[PDB]
Design a protein around this ligand. Structure first.
Ligand SMILES: O[C@@H]1[C@@H](O)[C@H](O[C@@H]2CO[C@@H](O[C@@H]3CO[C@@H](O)[C@H](O)[C@H]3O)[C@H](O)[C@H]2O)OC[C@H]1O
Length: 189
């Protein structure tokens, strides 16, 4: 594993965050590759990409994703002013993150329809400290662990529906888990 934090590796930004619970290891590999191994973890997020992201980046990902429990695989990042945590969810484990959320539209992109949602986090950790903030979601109907994501299609559809983003902070392909186990090996470009 590596130490939780951020930085650059082989030309790609990375970010590895966890809640301190234990049970998760994160490793940086050659080029845009990263691996995650977890067993009875807490909450964590790790992956490679860019800092800052952009609003029209085409992001490619390829590899294996084997969750056992609650986990997501997504194009993931933040904006500032307004503070937003966003997800383009390509696959997940036992929990669809939009469960119970209100559907705010549809967008077709990169071989699937996606459903659009907004949720809210109350007094949770963020890139600026503990805060209350909205989250934006595009959830892919046809799950996959390789593909291409045209981020502009998502950001434009969100804006059309009233979900506007601020200035872009980091933007990565992320594996997230919440009290689960699994393994993953993903290459970004
Ligand atoms: O020490 C600071 C870190 O906490 C910070 O990193 C961010 C911490 O919050 C993470 O957010 C969670 C992502 O997963 C969701 O399910 C949770 O609800 C969020 O709270 C965020 O992804 C990390 O980047 O960075 C700055 C450090 O000073």
């Amino acid at each position: 594993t590596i130490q939780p934090g951020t930085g650059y590796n082989n030309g790609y930004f990375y970010s590895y965050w966890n809640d301190g619970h234990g049970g998760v290891t994160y490793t940086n590999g050659p080029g845009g590759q990263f691996s995650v191994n977890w067993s009875n973890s807490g909450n964590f997020v790790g992956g490679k990409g860019w800092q800052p992201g952009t609003k029209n980046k085409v992001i490619n990902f390829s590899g294996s994703y084997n969750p056992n429990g609650n986990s997501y695989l997504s194009v993931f990042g933040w904006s500032r002013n307004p503070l937003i945590e966003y997800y383009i969810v390509e696959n997940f484990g036992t929990y669809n993150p939009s469960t119970g959320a209100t559907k705010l539209g549809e967008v077709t992109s990169d071989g699937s329809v996606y459903d659009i949602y907004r949720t809210q986090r109350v007094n949770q950790p963020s890139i600026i400290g503990t805060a209350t903030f909205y989250q934006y979601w595009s959830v892919r109907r046809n799950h996959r662990s390789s593909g291409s994501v045209n981020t502009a299609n998502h950001f434009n559809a969100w804006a059309q529906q009233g979900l506007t983003l601020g200035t872009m902070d980091y933007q990565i392909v992320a594996v997230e888990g919440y009290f689960s186990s699994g393994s993953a090996s993903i290459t970004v470009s």
